Design a protein around this ligand. Structure first.
Ligand code: HEC
Ligand SMILES: [Cl-]
Ligand SMILES: [Cl-]
Ligand SMILES: [Cl-]
Length: 79
């Protein structure tokens, strides 16, 4: 059971891709401003994503997805 993976696939991958590189120019995820700090990544997700409808993903959802992405997307933290 990997709820963060499942939630990311259901609510995020449509735009951000299976590996986080979805969208123009390599995507918004790898190296993002808050992507080095679990709590700030989760907070940004909670506040703003999915785009235009953040309530689709509850607080727990945002935490689980942030964990999934930090654990599975190489190069997510800013260098
Ligand atoms: C589903 C739950 C998610 C998660 C975890 C993320 N997104 Fe998105 N996202 C989209 C666009 C166009 C941007 C650029 C911002 C803008 O100009 O409005 C983003 C940005 C992000 C970030 C980076 C934020 C930062 O701190 O700079 C992160 C961490 C992020 N997203 C995560 C577009 C979309 C979608 C398009 C329809 C969907 C769906 C999502 N995002 C969903 C999610
Ligand atoms: Cl997970
Ligand atoms: Cl991808
Ligand atoms: Cl795009």
């Amino acid at each position: 059971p990997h709820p963060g993976e499942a939630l990311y696939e259901a609510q995020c991958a449509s735009c951000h891709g299976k590996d986080g590189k979805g969208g123009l120019a390599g995507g918004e995820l790898l190296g993002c401003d808050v992507c080095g700090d679990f709590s700030l990544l989760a907070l940004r997700i909670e506040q703003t994503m999915p785009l235009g409808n953040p309530e689709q993903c509850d607080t727990q959802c945002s935490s689980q997805i942030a964990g999934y992405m930090l654990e599975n997307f190489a190069g997510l933290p800013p260098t």
